[PDB]
Amino acid sequence: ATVPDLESDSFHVDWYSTYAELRETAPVTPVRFLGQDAWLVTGYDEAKAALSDLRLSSDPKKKYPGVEVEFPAYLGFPEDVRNYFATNMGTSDPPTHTRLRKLVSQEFTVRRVEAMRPRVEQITAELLDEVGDSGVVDIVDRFAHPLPIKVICELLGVDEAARGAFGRWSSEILVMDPERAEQRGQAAREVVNFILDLVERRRTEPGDDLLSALISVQDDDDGRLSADELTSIALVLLLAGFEASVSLIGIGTYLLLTHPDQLALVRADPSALPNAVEEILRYIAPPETTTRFAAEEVEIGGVAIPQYSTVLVANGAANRDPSQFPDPHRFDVTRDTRGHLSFGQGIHFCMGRPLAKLEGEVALRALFGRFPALSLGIDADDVVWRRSLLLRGIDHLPVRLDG
């Protein structure tokens, strides 16, 4: 048959329609992406099973005989910077993942996150106070973008002076263009340098932030975090922790604005926002696809995936599986969102889930409440989507504040 290319517009224009078509052809199909053959999983059952089957590694630095592990996400990154991006929990298999996650979960506690709420509401308040009450504004550059950035930067004790710039660095990191590869390798290097310097400043100037906390964590038999592991933990938390949240807010803002029916519900019932945040994740999952490597020949949904293959688990596609989520195309704030694969599934489940939801709820509530007549300042079908299978989102969302 025809091997679909993941670069084609079909996967970037009304893409939830092509997914559903492939999912109906074969839930597990071979594909071409970035110049490598891979397997795309677009079925719910298949995706869940895949995230649970541990023969599929999340480790890109594992060497095997006569083969080269190349996770698409690392398009362009020189080896030394790849290792810096891949020496944490999200890119490690047990037992290392096990000790890495245990040491971090010790400080990255629900307590710490709950003690943040007040500042999160304060930061949220300050931003909206600076927009005014009239005209059109880019809700991304003015709200959805800085809020998450101020939050995680405060969490990791980022020096606000020598802060910023990475915002441009991560923008470039989130798109995998086979030609801008060098620009992608250069951005990645910059990020790694900011972090290396960040921790050293932290190593020298203690504080009671999560990062200084991680620098002093220790355990009986599990041990403590080494330099490389620590610098990598900090990087992933700061990057995957702010960008993914930005998508939550922007997408979430767009969605309600275009589904007045749902906005009214959220607006009347307060207890409806926690669930509204969940349907947002389900409907347009930021982590469009997740990557695994077949360390052994695996069988997914009757299909035998050859050993040493690159498996791309399309979380976003799995969320729209009709046999698991009835009428997957109706954005419904009342729906049962239980079982969606946006925070992951299995052992690599998102550690930051409670901080993510803390932001989603606090942000959206403040926005729609202080601006009861908030409107989308552009044709809905004109909203530009980010061509990223790595992290989907909106980079410019113009809204009118007063009317």
Ligand X SMILES: Nc1cc2ccccc2c2ccccc12
| Four-residue CA torsion sign, 185, 186, 187, 193 | positive
Interaction of residue 185 with ligand X, rule CB under 6 A: no
CB 122 within 8 A of CB 100: no
In angstroms, what CA-CA distances link 54 with 59, 295, 307, 323?
11, 9, 13, 25
**Residue 356 touches which of ligand X, ligand HEM, none (Cβ within 5-8 Å per kind):** ligand HEM
Annotated ligand binding at 153? The verdict is: no
DSSP string, 224-240: B--HHHHHHHHHHHHHH
Q: Does 352 bind ligand HEM (CB under 6 A)?
A: yes
**Residue 245 annotated as catalytic:** yes
The one catalytic residue among 314, 359, 363, 366: 359
Q: Which residue in the set 22, 56, 89, 255 belongs to the binding site for ligand HEM (CB under 6 A)?
A: 89
185 part of the interface to ligand HEM, by CB under 6 A: no
Among 34, 120, 158, 240, contact with ligand X (rule: CB under 6 A): 240
The C-alpha angle 181, 342, 48, rounded to 5 degrees, equals 100
Please tell me which residue in 57, 92, 245, 309 is annotated as part of the active site.
Answer: 245
Closest-CA residue to 321 (of 51, 50, 41): 41
Using CB under 6 A as the binding rule, whether residue 90 contacts ligand X is answered as yes
Find out whether 151 and 116 touch, Cβ atoms under 8 Å: yes
Q: Segment contacting ligand HEM (CB under 6 A): 6-14, 178-186, 285-293, 394-402?
A: 285-293
Q: Which does 377 bind (CB under 5 to 8 A by kind): ligand X, ligand HEM, none?
A: none
Token representation of residue 174 = 């989130």
Closest-CB residue for ligand X? Answer: 90
The region of 59-67, 234-242, 300-308, 380-388 touching ligand HEM under the rule CB under 6 A is 234-242
Whether omega for the bond prior to residue 95 falls within 30 degrees of 0, making it cis, is: yes
User: d(Cα 369, Cα 233) in Å, to the nearest integer?
Assistant: 36
DSSP characters over 92-152: --TTHHHHHHHHHHTTS-HHHHHTTHHHHHHHHHHHHHTT-SSSEEEHIIIIITHHHHHHH
Applying CB under 6 A, among 262, 290, 310, 337 the residue interacting with ligand HEM is 290
Choosing from 154, 350, 375, 388, which is the catalytic residue?
A: 350
- Our answer to whether residue 350 is catalytic in this structure is yes
Residue 146 binding result from ligand X, ligand HEM, none, given CB thresholds of 5 to 8 Å by partner type? none
**Is residue 101 part of the contact set for ligand HEM (CB under 6 A)?**
yes
Q: Residue 351 binds what, of ligand HEM, ligand X, none (CB under 5 to 8 Å, by partner type)?
A: ligand HEM
Residue 248 contact, options ligand X, ligand HEM, none, Cβ 5-8 Å cut-off depending on partner type: ligand HEM
Residue 158, phi-psi category: left (phi > 0), alpha (psi -120 to 50), beta (remainder): beta
Say whether 243 is catalytic.
Answer: yes
Is residue 153 annotated as a catalytic residue, yes or no?
A: no
CB 321 within 8 A of CB 314: no
Alpha-carbon gap, residue 353 to 340, rounded angstroms: 13
Give the residue, chosen from 75, 158, 225, 248, that forms a contact with ligand HEM under the rule CB under 6 A. 248
Sign of the dihedral defined by the CA atoms of residues 235, 239, 242, 244, in that order: negative
Handedness of CA 166, 172, 176, 180 (dihedral sign): negative
The least distance separating ligand HEM from the CB of residue 72, rounded to whole angstroms, comes to 13
d(CA 113, CA 241): 13
User: From the annotation, which residues make up the binding site?
Assistant: 350
Give me the residues that bind ligand X (CB under 6 A), please. Answer: 73-74, 85, 90-91, 173, 236, 239-240, 244, 286-287, 350, 352, 390-391
Catalytic residues: 240, 243, 245, 350, 359
Give me the residues that bind ligand HEM (CB under 6 A), please. Answer: 58, 89-90, 101, 152, 236-237, 240-241, 244-245, 248, 281, 286-287, 290, 342-344, 348, 350-352, 355-356
